[PDB]
Symmetry: C2
Subunit: 557 residues, 2 copies
Amino acid sequence: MAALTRNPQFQKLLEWHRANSANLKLRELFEADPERFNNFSLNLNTNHGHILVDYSKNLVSKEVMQMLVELAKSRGVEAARDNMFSGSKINYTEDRAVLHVALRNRSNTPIKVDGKDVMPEVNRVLDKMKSFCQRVRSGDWKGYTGKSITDIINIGIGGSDLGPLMVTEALKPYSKGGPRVWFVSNIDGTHIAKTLASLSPETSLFIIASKTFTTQETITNAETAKEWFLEAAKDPSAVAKHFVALSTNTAKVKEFGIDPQNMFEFWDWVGGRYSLWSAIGLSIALHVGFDHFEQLLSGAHWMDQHFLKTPLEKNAPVLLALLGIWYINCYGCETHALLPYDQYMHRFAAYFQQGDMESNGKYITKSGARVDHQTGPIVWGEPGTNGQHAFYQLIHQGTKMIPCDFLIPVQTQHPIRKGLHHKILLANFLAQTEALMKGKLPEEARKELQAAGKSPEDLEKLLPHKVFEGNRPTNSIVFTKLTPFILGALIAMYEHKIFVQGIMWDINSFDQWGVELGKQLAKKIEPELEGSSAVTSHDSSTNGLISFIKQQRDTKL
Amino acid sequence: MAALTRNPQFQKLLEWHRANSANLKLRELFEADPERFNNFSLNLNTNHGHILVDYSKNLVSKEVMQMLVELAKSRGVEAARDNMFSGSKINYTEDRAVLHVALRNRSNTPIKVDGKDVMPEVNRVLDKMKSFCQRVRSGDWKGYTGKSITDIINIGIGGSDLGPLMVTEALKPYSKGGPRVWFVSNIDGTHIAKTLASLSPETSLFIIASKTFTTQETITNAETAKEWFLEAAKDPSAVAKHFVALSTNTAKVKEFGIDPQNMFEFWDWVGGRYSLWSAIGLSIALHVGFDHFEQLLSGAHWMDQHFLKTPLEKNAPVLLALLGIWYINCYGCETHALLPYDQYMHRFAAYFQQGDMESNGKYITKSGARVDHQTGPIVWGEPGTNGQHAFYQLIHQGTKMIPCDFLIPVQTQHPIRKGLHHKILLANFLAQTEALMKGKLPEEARKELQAAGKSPEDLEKLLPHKVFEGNRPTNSIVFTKLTPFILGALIAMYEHKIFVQGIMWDINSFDQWGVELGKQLAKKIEPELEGSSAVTSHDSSTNGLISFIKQQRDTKL
């Protein structure tokens, strides 16, 4: 077996679930205990707003929470946490520290890797970013014809894209005075082509985000942008006015035509999917200003400290992690839905798809043994209220158990019509989790059918269709306002949830060996596509698809 | 028990699965049988391009496919289909026909509901759409100050939003010469606020899309739009130049105050999530032109005829549906990922979240029996290569089985850099499904680490992390080009897949009773948010969240 399944607190939890989970009914839990919301929620005061983490609509009793906390302890969560924060090389397959918490370490307390405090270099790069932001935002940085920059284009993939994109979308109201921001990530030529079509070479600045500066898709996109730019500028020396790098590869950066003074460094202890807090966040700082970027870091820092200092039983990311374990490893739920009731947060779920699924979509434990239990869930979702009219039908009346996190700011950035829209949004947010829990009893549905004038025959036929079984668990995460600080705290909360789950599963949340095979095979196929000759070097499906491609690419439609 | 589980062919399939499925190994299936691609793929010639549905990388043999086809026949798929197409009232809980196929019935063969041909009215509304599109696109239609329309704003949610949004995004290259299109859907005030901030009341035309014309989100948004408009125009007669309606509810439309000549009608047998083919597609037609809209309809019509006339064993939507059943009901896979390798198709998976999940997220059968088996899956995904660099780690090395459909056009709309970007995109599309199928054996990974110069200790430490178990099934769907015609055929293909699965589960794919309870509960909460008084009328969580909202809404941040 594996570490988790060999653990006796886990065996006890599993045994308790088998014997008792059928007895757990949300309706009954709330009816028996009017202190339930009080005892199963955390109202966090950050001094820059409150975050209420309401986990009371979960299929848990006091005893279940006690068992889960005991399990987190006996799986080494407290020790693993301290190891991360101290700079121990907890990314064990790559022998690397994991120090995204250093990037936002506002206290400046020394954090050592290999005996050397990392904070001077973190703060050096931050200072460089702040200086660059001043130059671009003020209009002092001029393009090749002497004009101020109006547009910033981040070119990057995965971690170099999703973070900056989600945060700039989420924090759009804080971007007054800032340049427009664009994100190019897909190798699909459509992405760069449609971005470039709406831009001027004179006033656009490109941020090429790649640690190694050899990332195929990113560098291809970058070179395409350079080609486009040089067609207009006709001067290789002008590239340095319009292209900067988030990288450590001085030589490749120089070769591209970028001034190495405009290379913004980060370190191997910064994972791609934990990188928005580093130089990778340069586009965020340009868009909303460095002051707001620091507020984002400070919120994350607040949450880092909460995670570090708080006893497990009242520790927000730990509790969220434990609930997930309960549903994944005891109930066997394959997915987790993230449902922010906020249009600005429309890319939040997509971001945590990488954050969660690339971290914890793993099957080998620290010992090298295969897991014999589930690990990370499939993460998905869309913002409310749109989801209600898309897929909540399945959540309410399907055959799947789907843990959902509902998120919403109390205060809206756009209180139009005296707050009418936000009142409706809030009411739907509250109503949906209430409905998921309560359902609708046959006696309730029967009376509704009778009042609608349904015949006894039609009533009988329709009745079961109108019943909602309920007992569907949710978390409600409510916060004062979606500010840079509060957004930073929320992202950090989920990063730490992911960390806790990985430790409990005995997996490495911080590597990504599963990307290798697809990369290797793609490199083999690339040269085979060119020309008319038949490709026979793969399985018949791959061969057959390539044949179709070669046959269909010259057809005029 | 339910119809499916009582079915003898289903119990036979399940028993075969129990006894034999562990012996299905894709790598070995392909080595043993050079004809595998040929026997497990459909190359469809539409005369307007080809669609290759390659299902060879599935965990199936000839025997499995034979049993699945036999099950489909046993479940009455052909009769159910014919009933749909002839206008039988197969939406049995609402006593309605289901005739999205009539909307695109290019042949104009009569289809009767209650003994009356529906086609004259379908075609009457199509002619009205054609005329309106010509007037707006030509610049002949003038706003209240006498200026041509530059922007179209679709206000609608769910079925009234996702279809037109996904199609206009997918068909963006075909929109040259058309007005800019905007979609407002969320009740969240952000959505309409940031849309209106970018518009002029003089040159904006709003399209209020609502089957019922009573949906709170849509009518609220519409009323906000009208107030904004009237603040500028100061003339109620001007509304008729700037607002049109897409609805089935004439009375409610006139009640809102729209010119009855500005109402584009559809019918109760048009489901919201099947409605882009109706008047609901007006924003599509305005954006890309009525000719391209007709091509979209014609593509769907082609696929309707394929579905209607083709033997089950060669019938694309039926085969896709059957593979789905195999994974859902035999393997127990909760999800289905849709992965189009096309940035224009970035909303394709979202569309089918509604389409699939709202249709088949059901638990009561035609007989009134509660299902005792799984129904519709959770549908999710992102376009390649975006999704690739986000979450494929979990698909390759997680603990979940995830059937994936990979989709790509052979011909790109933007063949930049002499096709370099599309070559890379295609190679990744191909490599990923090859990788998922083949994996990488311990001995293969050992040889790679051997060659990298890893020491015995370093090799042994890393080895298990580098192993890919493979045997992960995929569909590859490749088509000549994403034209309006081909897109129409692809959407209809999945609509019919959803239909077939529903018939097989004995559920009603065409109702959505699961939305009612959330709506009722939201109406109750709305007025309780007003004022500073404590709410005690709900469970303690709802009460507590409301207390939080009231406490937090006045805090300055």
